[PDB]
Design a binder for this molecule. Structure first.
Ligand SMILES: O=C(O)c1cc(C(=O)O)c2c(n1)C(=O)C(=O)c1cc(C(=O)O)[nH]c1-2
Ligand SMILES: O=C(O)c1cc(C(=O)O)c2c(n1)C(=O)C(=O)c1cc(C(=O)O)[nH]c1-2
Ligand SMILES: [Ca+2]
Ligand SMILES: [Ca+2]
Lengths: 70, 597, 597, 70
């Protein structure tokens, strides 16, 4: 794998001698858990909602109130 | 922000991280120079009340200096006419569990500034280790707003300086070592409202590609690659965080930064180029659309986190074409220059000939040619790989002198051995997967573990190093160039040094309290030029020192490489100010006296 | 220790706390003086890696400087030819619960030194907040011995510098605020064996009275009083700890110190004179027998802890008798002079006319005349009491110039209101029993809470103050006098200042990182005179700052008095070195370079 | 109580107007608990013993061993 052989522009990855093109199904399989994988997308929906909530309150009263339970 | 542009034109001000939108750390001030530098003395100092790495550098807006500390990210406003009086202070309360998800010390890289209007106060913009971007009224220090921009429960934190462009505050991301997928957001400084937010991996819409993304260089890659160069969903916990520095071109409307390394560090766990990570990125300041994108390190194998500083300039290239350019010394050992309008790759020079992960970087194809003997993979231990994961360059913000057309680079000279291991992903835990051993590279003292830095002056076009000196420790804090023919940089062993910038001659140095990992900066207040830098060792190189580790493989491998640094420095935290003859307001003994008579 | 006497005769050395056995903080060095002091500049600095109050001052033995930090009481040995190289370091592990029984900040007042023989290494003697007295091989920093001399479970800790006399290391005591009964012990530096240990209250045998105790002044009191001036066993938890400074007369073989306040602070809970507390004490260095003892504050009502510095001199008194003398500025507002051989009381002068707890101190009877309106008792709140409990003088180690016969005193100007309350004794808890409100005294700014210090020059015999200046904060760190006609002292607002010692004129000052509560010291290394002082605010005045308190009655009342100090300083921890022109080893740029070429 | 009236040399304490000569039995009685009062004397017997133990071992082997369970 020297990085110069490209099946497409911006896409030259090759596996190395003795390692597979796909890892799924192999001894390298990461077996990630989708629940875990999505954790950050969920966490960001909360931040954005609470943020939107704090700007809109700010817009209206001219004072930023961090703790959105007001 | 045109008001920032104008205030940056005044030597009495240093108004943004990296001083100006060129991010070039250059002052046209001549009052301190090669011919009197032996007269430079200590003028005053200020301690922050915190230990751990102190990165970045203060801001100065006329009469006020603003300084920022390690966690918990205190902000202070000092009165240059009497710098011992604190105009104000902001002391955040943060959950102390933020400490536990910071990979590489409780550091923070600094403050930005939004010059106000008649409706709205000027504002100091700061980040907090616990994820928040906070805006402070710059005259009173009272909270103006505070938005969430990182959850520590999913492994995220903030260590960069944020950045002000137009009426926008831009903020980056930390945690690639915890599987965080890099995100960059702009909030509106008047309203605190989110204006755009984009990611470093996944579907193009989520990454924010412009319709004409890379049109001038389509061999770089164009559509669909933030998913095609992954397997399944491995992009979601894919890294690409951007915790380094910004730069900005007012005419192209483009901000430049580099995105970090992909996760985990175990390359075997993520086949594929891992696109948008490791990428030099240009985004429209206002919509945040990505104009162009150059992946320096396809399928990272070494944690070469692509976040380094970006210095803008105008030069004539080798064919005679007068160009608008960015220059960008990378962890991977390669200093890059691109035309900042289209992406055209112009130079890609090794930072030192010892670099061995690549044989060269082909300019036409823009690919790095890999030496497979220095790569990493499962069930293998790679040996004598240069650069190491700490890079031949890290987060130090360097300088460029546009008169000499020379870049002044604080370099690292650290090689490594490296073996990955399989680990699961669990949100809010570390997600590293390798064991490193690091040591000085070939030109340093490998037996006795000294000789881990260099300082070098470089021309981006001719590709030449005008001069080079080895340094006992990595030069980690960046550098400052001035028109007095001097370049200045702090060392991890606690000196502020000044070399002659034409020749590299060492001409002055002074023992500060602690090692330096911030860049020096300069400003003129009442016709006196002062040079100020933050003291307080830490950051990645300080982790063994700072947390009392001895396992050479601890601190992600930095413990063994720096075992000796603690023979030369301990922890600290302060700002140290210098000037010709130590001239300073207390030269008048009654300034700050209760008696005054 | 005659070897210590001899090394103290060399300006290249500063070998004990207070510099010499006179404890007079005087240097005959003239290289820095009234005529060039404006040329004094910063030479180098060293940060300790710790925050909180940094008290005391380093030692210098030829080429090695030894510095000591706040808890956990690190010791470091610095190489004066390259002070950035740490020769060695000692880092104790201590139970962190020691913090919880320290009344007034994690401070420590410094190191002593035992010059070795041919059988035995020279030794650095240090104390630890957790009660231990530790001896270190002074060239390697390896533990030589470690004895227990304070149990935190019974409320005890160590904050003083210990002291070396002969082949003996003497160690004091802390915790009168936790009911600890004061004890002083001598251990044998060769063997680590206890040589004698005595108490400040109880039966005479336990206190260690000499058969001829007070024979020259029997109206002071003689036998049986450490129990007679108590009710029942209230002496057992009686205070008298000695956490201040020592002095020593080689010919009389006598060490002098003062014992602290009785416990609790509620005077109603312990009727009686509470003898041996509050006492100026002279003990045979070797057997530890108490030769004489003068109680300055009978039945303390104000926490006037009698632990202050003791300065020895030879003067002609008012009748013509050439005398050997001790001079001793007390918390209670009274600066005392006694003949150091017999106890004869010579002068007892108010430190400032505002003192009101006493009308005067009758010299014949040696009694203080009490003004009952400024005393304390249960169900009463005393108002406008001067001095406050922080004293018109605290633990700052002052200087005496034997040429001018003048003492240079850093004074506090803090009055108080005071109400006690009933509380039980429980070993290992606080045992205070009062609520204080403190503020600047009459000559300061009582509305705006500034004006809490003075600096004054004083002659012990004629009773005159040659000059006096008010200071914004209490001058808490002591002072340093030299033959260049300069006196030097640090301020809690972070200046090292130099006044003309003949006139008190302010002639120089420099903004250090943080407030100062240690005394400056001086030494000559390669024909260069350096002035060094510890920076790092804390101790009692810093408690509001250091622990983030706002309740004015918190920190035993110091919080309200110092609410303003944090507008002028934050926490720090470092040693700051100064010299004519900033001359320093790094003047040669290659000292400490990896390249060196 | 002005401190100048002394039933004996070094012993001038007087109670104040309205307060007793003895506090035991009064509303000011401290009621200390003797167990508590002796705590420090006990604690010091341990320190001295362990100390004596560490010097004597030192005397004999020339190396200080802090932890007296050796
Ligand atoms: O990807 C990340 O989220 C992240 C964050 C940081 C940081 O936030 O300080 C560093 C790194 N990575 C990193 O790879 C690295 O070598 C590093 C060195 C330092 C330092 O300042 O010395 N910080 C960081
Ligand atoms: O009696 C004691 O055991 C004890 C100890 C100490 C100390 O150990 O620092 C102080 C005091 N008392 C005390 O009363 C006091 O005002 C004080 C001020 C300070 C300081 O350095 O600022 N320490 C101490
Ligand atoms: Ca990283
Ligand atoms: Ca006390």
């Amino acid at each position: 794998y020297d990085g110069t052989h490209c099946k497409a522009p911006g896409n030259c990855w090759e596996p190395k001698p003795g390692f597979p093109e796909k890892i799924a199904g192999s001894k390298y399989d990461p077996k990630h858990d989708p629940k875990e994988l999505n954790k950050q997308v969920e966490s960001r929906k909360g931040e954005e909602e609470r943020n939107a909530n704090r700007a809109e309150h700010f817009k209206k009263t001219g004072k930023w109130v961090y703790d959105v339970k007001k | 922000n045109d008001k920032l542009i104008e205030l940056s034109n005044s030597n009495e001000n240093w108004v943004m991280p990296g001083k100006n939108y060129d991010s070039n750390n250059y002052s046209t001030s001549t009052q301190i120079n090669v011919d009197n530098v032996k007269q430079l003395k200590h003028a005053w100092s200020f301690s922050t009340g915190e230990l751990h790495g102190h990165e970045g550098a203060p801001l100065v807006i006329g009469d006020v200096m603003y300084v920022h500390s390690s966690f918990p990210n205190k902000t202070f406003a000092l009165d240059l006419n009497d710098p011992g009086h604190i105009l104000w202070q902001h002391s955040p309360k943060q959950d102390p569990a933020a400490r536990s998800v910071a990979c590489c010390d409780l550091v923070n890289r600094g403050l930005a500034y939004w010059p106000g209007d008649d409706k709205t106060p000027s504002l100091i913009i700061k980040t907090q280790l616990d994820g928040h971007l906070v805006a402070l009224n710059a005259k009173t220090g009272e909270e103006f707003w505070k938005v969430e921009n990182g959850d520590i429960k999913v492994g995220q934190t903030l260590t960069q300086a944020p950045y002000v462009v137009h009426d926008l505050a831009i903020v980056g991301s930390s945690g690639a070592e915890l599987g965080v997928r890099g995100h960059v957001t702009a909030y509106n400084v008047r309203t605190g409202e989110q204006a755009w937010r984009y990611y470093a991996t996944g579907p193009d819409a989520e990454i924010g590609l412009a319709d004409d993304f890379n049109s001038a260089n389509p061999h770089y890659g164009q559509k669909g690659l933030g998913t095609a160069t992954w397997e399944g969903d491995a992009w979601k916990i894919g890294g690409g965080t951007n915790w380094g520095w910004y730069a900005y071109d007012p005419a192209a409307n483009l901000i430049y930064y580099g995105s970090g390394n992909p996760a985990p560090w175990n390359e075997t766990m993520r086949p594929g180029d891992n696109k948008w990570t490791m990428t030099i990125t240009a985004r429209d300041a206002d919509t945040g659309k990505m104009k162009f994108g150059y992946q320096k390190t396809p399928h990272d194998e070494w944690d070469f986190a692509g976040v380094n500083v970006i210095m803008l300039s105008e030069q004539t290239d080798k064919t005679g074409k007068k160009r608008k350019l960015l220059t960008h010394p990378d962890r991977n050992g390669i200093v890059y220059t691109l035309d900042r309008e289209n992406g055209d790759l112009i130079s890609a020079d090794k930072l030192d000939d010892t670099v061995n992960v690549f044989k060269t970087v082909d300019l036409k194809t823009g690919l790095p040619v890999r030496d497979p003997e220095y790569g990493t993979r499962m069930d293998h231990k790679g040996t004598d790989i240069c650069p190491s994961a700490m890079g031949y360059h890290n987060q130090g913000h360097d300088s460029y002198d546009p008169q000499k057309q020379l870049f002044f680079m604080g370099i690292n000279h650290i090689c490594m051995d490296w073996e990955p291991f399989m680990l699961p992903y669990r949100a809010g835990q570390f997600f590293v997967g390798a064991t490193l051993w690091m040591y000085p590279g070939p030109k340093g003292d490998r037996q006795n573990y000294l000789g881990l830095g260099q300082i070098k002056a470089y021309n981006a076009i001719t590709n030449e190093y005008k001069w080079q000196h080895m340094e006992r420790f990595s030069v980690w804090g960046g550098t400052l160039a001035t028109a007095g023919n001097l370049v200045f940089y702090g060392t991890l062993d606690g000196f502020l040094k000044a070399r002659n910038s034409d020749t590299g001659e060492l001409v002055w140095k002074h023992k500060l309290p602690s090692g330096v990992i911030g860049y020096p900066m300069t400003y003129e207040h009442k016709g006196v030029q002062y040079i100020a830098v933050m003291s307080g060792v830490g950051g990645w190189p300080g982790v063994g020192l700072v947390f009392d580790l001895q396992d050479p493989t601890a601190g992600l491998g930095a413990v063994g490489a720096f075992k000796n640094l603690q023979n030369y420095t301990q922890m600290g935290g302060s700002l140290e100010v210098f000037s010709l003859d130590g001239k300073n307001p207390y030269d008048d003994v009654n300034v700050g006296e209760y008696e005054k008579g």
